[PDB]
Amino acid sequence: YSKIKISGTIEVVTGLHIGGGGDSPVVRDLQTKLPIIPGSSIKGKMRNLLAKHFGLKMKQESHNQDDERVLRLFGSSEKGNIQRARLQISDAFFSEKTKEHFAQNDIAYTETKFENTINRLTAVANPRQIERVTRGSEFDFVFIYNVDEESQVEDDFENIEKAIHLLENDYLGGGGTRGNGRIQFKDTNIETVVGEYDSTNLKIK
Amino acid sequence: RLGVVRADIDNLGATFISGIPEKYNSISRTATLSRQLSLFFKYELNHLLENYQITAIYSGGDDLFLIGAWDDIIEASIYINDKFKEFTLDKLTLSAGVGMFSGKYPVSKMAFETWDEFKKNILEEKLLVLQQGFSQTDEHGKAFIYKMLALLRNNEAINIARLAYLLARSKMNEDFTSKIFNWAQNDKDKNQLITALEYYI
């Protein structure tokens, strides 16, 4: 039995809007009053895109049943063919380096982007204001992958590597089509935390 | 969830023995008093329950042990109190309690768990106006109400300000929001509004 640790940081290329608190703020940690990326967000977007990668039936879409490989990665355990989840996606915390950097250069953590909208037949503007996490800020993320079957390790890592790439080109949070929240990963790393299983040949771009 | 209501006549010990002092304490007469109480508690309990999703579990003597749907249980309990106050001509009173318990619980453990103020003020006044407002304004899900609950449950003045602002961010008619704010200011009316909204869900 082994547990495999993946570490790295998330770099916000363009502003991020997780925004679960609902003007229209972003999710914040309550001990530091700083932005967070709840692991539900990352994990769900990864599942969603990686599922869309493989063939999904209309009935499969309605019943949330997905491909066998993605499901084995993420677990359904809903009916019948149960599958215990396998990769636990932790949350993200606003890393220390970026906090110090912004303090030193006196940079806000979060901006209030003002946006507008022209309804038709009236052309009348109705404004809005939306909070966005300042770009270039870095989050720390931690993934813990479990080996329920030794045979399948590189294949599962390759699957989540494709999901990582899909997240980078696409977006998290809201305003994704409107420009918000394209992200990149930096300084990834793997190290076997429990077990006796090597992780050197493993890689995630 | 299920609702369970248990009720007992408060002044039944005195009514059965002392009853009417010194002039009508005939054996036949207390018998007829017993007879009326019996016939009520075994016939009206059948008749009145018609419109409530309730099964009669234990009725008799002075013990009323009823279980059913939470909302239905509360409503019928109100109905039964009013009907009793009619039939007792406001001479005998009942003490009653309602507790909400999760389904499939061992009822042997539920049982051991278990007015006009409640009817007129909470249900009749606050509950209806809150219901109308939430009818008029949609999207106001358990999130919005739950933030309200959080605001009320922490009884501090800054929380009063927070409640004011949150109400401002809604789009409910000014009269509705102002009524909620005024009710929150009064400790009694806040406790009553809290109860009404807890009933709301």
Partner: protein
Amino acid sequence: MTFAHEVVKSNVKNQVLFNGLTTSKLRNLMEQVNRLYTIAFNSNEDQLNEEFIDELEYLKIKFYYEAGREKSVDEFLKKTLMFPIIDRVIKKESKKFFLDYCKYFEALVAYAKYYQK
């Protein structure tokens, strides 16, 4: 000092508030105060760092500028005793009093938003 917090209801005139004050010209003040509040949250001890103090100085500078740009905001700041309380906070250099000030400002702001055209 809470009389200056419920004076906002005392300044509801006809139909403008604080002579037409709107949250559109006060949003900058809220953002600046919140930015310093998060820095105070990161701070662990009571005695404020000097750079934080200079941040307070910049805050008051922004207060004066905003009062200069807009008249209703100027009335708000003066009639609510904003500058004296700011200077007092600077004098006390204590975190806890600063949090108290932020709560006061928040109450002012929120109550103001409650009443708006």
